[PDB]
Amino acid sequence: GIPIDADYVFDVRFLPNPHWDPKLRPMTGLDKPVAAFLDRHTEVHNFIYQTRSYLEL
Amino acid sequence: RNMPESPEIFEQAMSNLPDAFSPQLLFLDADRNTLIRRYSLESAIDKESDLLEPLRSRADLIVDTSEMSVHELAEMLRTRLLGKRERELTMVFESFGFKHGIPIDADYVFDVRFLPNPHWDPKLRPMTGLDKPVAAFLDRHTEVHNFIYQTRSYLELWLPMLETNNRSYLTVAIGCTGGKHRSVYIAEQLADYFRSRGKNVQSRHRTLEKR
Amino acid sequence: RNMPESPEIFEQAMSNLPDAFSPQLLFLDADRNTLIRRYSDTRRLHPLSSKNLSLES
Amino acid sequence: DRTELKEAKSAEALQWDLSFRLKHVIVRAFRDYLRQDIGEILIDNPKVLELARQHIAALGRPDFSSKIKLYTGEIPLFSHYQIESQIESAFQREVRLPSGGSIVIDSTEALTAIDINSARATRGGDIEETAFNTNLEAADEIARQLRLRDLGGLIVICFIDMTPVRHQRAVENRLREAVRQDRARIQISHISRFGLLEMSRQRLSSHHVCPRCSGTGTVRDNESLSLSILRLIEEEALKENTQEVHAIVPVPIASYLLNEKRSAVNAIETRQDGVRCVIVPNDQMETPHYHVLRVTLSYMLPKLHEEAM
Amino acid sequence: KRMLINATQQEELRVALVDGQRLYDLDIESPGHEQKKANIYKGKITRIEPSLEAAFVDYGAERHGFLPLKEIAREYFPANYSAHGRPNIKDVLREGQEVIVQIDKEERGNKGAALTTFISLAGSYLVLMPNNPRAGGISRRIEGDDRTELKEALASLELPEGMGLIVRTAGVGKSAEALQWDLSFRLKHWEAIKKAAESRPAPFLIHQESNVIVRAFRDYLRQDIGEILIDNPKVLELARQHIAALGRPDFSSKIKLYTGEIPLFSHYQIESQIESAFQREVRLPSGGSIVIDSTEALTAIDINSARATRGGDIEETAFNTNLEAADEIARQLRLRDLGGLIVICFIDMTPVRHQRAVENRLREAVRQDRARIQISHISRFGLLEMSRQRLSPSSSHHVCPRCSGTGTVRDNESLSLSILRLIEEEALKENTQEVHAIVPVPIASYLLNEKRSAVNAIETRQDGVETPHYHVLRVRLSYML
Amino acid sequence: MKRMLRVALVDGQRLYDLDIESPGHEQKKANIYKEAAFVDYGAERH
RNA sequence: UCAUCAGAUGACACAACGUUGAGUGAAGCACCCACUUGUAACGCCUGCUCCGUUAAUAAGAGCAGGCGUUUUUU
């Protein structure tokens, strides 16, 4: 459930699920391998950046 | 105005066009008077229709737009060209009040506390977001228009991917403190845009619907 | 929309104008705030949405 | 054109017909369809066709009746192929829709009522547009079934709620358009702030109450009846000059009456000192239906009372 | 006014507010209302669930209910509890323990019904959390100085340690002492609730809600009432439940326990009206009729009246029947408890001001009604609309077996012909070599005899092949089939 | 197109109107046959 | 029972009318209209508001009647 302290909420589901790789599924969010998988996918960059443009604004 | 005297030339050049760009022809029809509502007045059209008749013969699709509407046309078009996906969204725009709490179900939410508050004018305090006084009052203050735009842009950019994977709902909930003045107006207008683009939409003014 | 990146394009195009028909231009204008307030007519994006920060920019 | 004939098929042609009426039903169905934009009129019974030939001379229009001809094949006409859908529709209290929505042509004693039920698809999408779309389909079917079932008067409708007022207005306009082709006395109105729609009449020109409940849609519950009739009986019991009490009721009633509530019955005998009480379960009587008579064997009086009522 | 209570048979609870000798308000209890919500109960855990982190508990026969782990109180937890995320219900309590609990969620799904350890108390002014201390504060509607000064008044009042309180939304808060009174009364009731529950370990209903008292006094009763009547004195003390526990004993005078040798309702001769409350059409009180029917999409009423065929009467007398009716409409309205879409067929009249007059008579009755009502002007056709929201948000044999809600009989001859044509349409279908079917006997009785050679033709065409309840199955002894 | 087929009126494809025969008909006095307080018009209620 | 997809609570505030017409709804409350013209009768009454009065009762006014009897018409 949504954290009660949330002021904004941005779903992120549709981004490429790292789950596909069974190897990465046990690995946590902070573990570099997943950071690599995410880095591999540019769409991630597009989202981060566009979201950085949305807030800063 | 673009209709040639000799359409043989029309189809000849229509042949000339390069292959990659596939041509398609749509023709339209409605009641004679139905057209007058959007608009001599019988014979102009009759002779012109003779001019246009070759096209209707050549029409790939013909529609009867007598009872048509923008949404009708937009959906008709979306399926007409983009093809139909049984996968389909139904965006739900909810206006909630941060007092009462964030909706139990919500994919995206946007705080609209910073935008000009109709609350400042006391004659407005009772009236709610769907009373044209406040609708106007915002419409003036540009920042409102600025936000309505930028947000509509953000969603629009991330809307296609979400279409993939057969999502059955996507809910965006827009929140003021009380959820009567700002969030309502934004939810409404912001909905209408997406309605124009033809995606299915459904509004819900959660605070007003309390009573 | 129909604005080329190269300047000289419409220049030479104006040059090719035949019949010495008077090429009389017209031009409209208004302020940034007025424009924005007017550009929100349920219209599409300023085609300059190529990572262009904001309608204003 | 009327003006010239006023002094005067011509009036000469009119004169022949005037003799019969002045000198003086199924053919009246032909009078219902004077438009005669119909070419094919096929009869499976040739005797009826010959009666139609006798009625072609009375109709006095051989040129219009040139295409009339008895035909073996109802299916090509769709008389035996397509028409049947509507054929039973005219008695379907509810009508499905091509859109999937539906209607409920009610028969309230005070006035005619119809609500329209949206196509209850698996999920909900754009329910507002869905409402208008389904609404438009409905409106179309409305006038058809309205004429076809041959019922009009104080008609009212309850649409799926429609927020956009202008779009609601467009719907109303569709209604105006609905019956332009119809020839009957019609007078539409506007939406209700509630959302209802006052409607027009059809009084221009096969059933009865149901056997159980005497035409009341519902039936009161047995447990409710266990106390109702009891009160009735005790009420009549105090009636003076009363010697005994007769009661008629169907079996499941008297069952839970006596065996299940024997105590009150006996207490009712003690309070009502001296007036006899008889209760008679009868198989023929319906669940609400029964009788009673305070003024024969305890298992053989109902024959007598039945010969009474 | 006069109040009528009959409980000769506990099954049906008939209670009414009659002005003079005529009944006005209706609250005949419908057994099976089963408003189990907020009913204190006993029982024993049926199925501790590690996977669902919840415990079924058998309050009653239908299901074994539901218990979220978080809802549990200190009494259920052992004296030696441990904090490791505390997800372990087996560690909390072994099943079978006796329980204290109130109805929480009206079972409305195949899933269990929901119940909570933290019980609640429904007080006119106040609400007590007997166990959970956390809950507190004031409801929304009351605010301002009321919110400020009431927070001073409740702070002045002293509650047992570990007990929270929620002031009802009816926060007049005028008498801090009244708060004290009703609170304490609830406190003694809560103390009386757990003690009595300590009677035995079996599952049983400790407390519940019943229009008999919860709705009879908080909603139905008013200060204007002059007479209070009770039939079953067994519940006379159950009436003293509130005689002063409401904090206003002034009705002690009102109590007038029925003792006559006549059933109380007839003693005021009300059953005529009462039956009218169900009798489909009501004879107009002055004379005429007010006929009611529900479309189940709407509800409509008609007023064919004056009870005559040919005589001397006028439109202002028909207009007179429309005014007198309006009231009885309101009466029947509140009585049979309608809510939704209501429309009339007033007999129309030339005097327009008469139209205004009659609607005025209607609106005056609407103002004194507890419910909320929307009204509309008459129609050009005359059909006047009206919508009153149901005051009571509560398949009652909705369709008779023969009627099916329609209450309309397809004619036997029509029934036959429909069947015959359906048979023929079935015969021509591909892969048909027989047409077996079920048909009401009386239809068949007059069916074949008139249609011997007709059926002969039916057979020749495709060679080789109650009233609602007819079902024909096509084939690709009659008495046993 | 319009076709007439129990009596059936088919307008083009869909059925524009219907007509069935039942015992009796909607006929005014002496349609197909032949201030007093009470009179014999076939009844006396009117 | 790890994942994935679908399925009745602090410290606040609330003026001026010059928010006036920048923009007048939402719900209440009031008044205010329209234009085609097409059964009796009595018996006794175990009782219910009230109203009078003195005498709270009680007597008595009005009489949804439950129904007895009598003609009798709906």
Residue numbers in the entry:
A (entry chain B): 172 to 228
B (entry chain A): 58 to 96, 111 to 282
C (entry chain D): 58 to 114
D (entry chain N): 147 to 154, 175 to 190, 213 to 393, 400 to 489, 497 to 510
E (entry chain L): 2 to 395, 399 to 469, 480 to 490, 498 to 502
F (entry chain N): 1 to 5, 15 to 43, 54 to 65
What does the study report here?
RapZ then presents GlmZ to the endoribonuclease RNase E in a manner that directs cleavage within the base‐pairing site of the sRNA, thereby inactivating it and silencing synthesis of the synthase (Göpel et al, 2013; Gonzalez et al, 2017; Durica‐Mitic et al, 2020). The protomers have two domains of roughly equal size: the N‐terminal domain (NTD) bears Walker A and B motifs and resembles an adenylate kinase, while the C‐terminal domain (CTD) bears structural similarity with the sugar‐binding domain of phosphofructokinase. Here, we have elucidated the structures of both the binary complex of RapZ:GlmZ and the ternary complex of the RNase E catalytic domain (RNase E‐NTD), RapZ and GlmZ, using electron cryo microscopy (cryoEM).
To capture a precleavage Michaelis–Menten state of the catalytic domain, the active site residue aspartate 346 in RNase E‐NTD was replaced with cysteine, which changes the metal requirement for ribonuclease activity from Mg2+ to Mn2+ (Thompson et al, 2015). We purified the recombinant mutant RNase E‐NTD, RapZ and GlmZ and combined these components to reconstitute the ternary ribonucleoprotein complex in buffer without Mn2+ but with Mg2+to ensure proper folding of GlmZ and to lock the complex in the precleavage encounter state. Previously published crystal and cryoEM structures of RNase E‐NTD have revealed many degrees of freedom at both the quaternary and tertiary levels, enabling flexible accommodation of substrates (Callaghan et al, 2005; Koslover et al, 2008; Bandyra et al, 2012, 2018; Dendooven et al, 2022). It may therefore not be surprising that in the ternary complex structure the 5′‐sensor/S1 domains of the RNase E‐NTD have adopted an opened conformation that can accommodate the binary complex—a configuration not previously observed but which may account for the capacity of RNase E to be guided to preferred cleavage sites by RNA structure. The predicted structure of SLIII fits well into the density present on the surface of the RNase E small domain and RNase H fold.
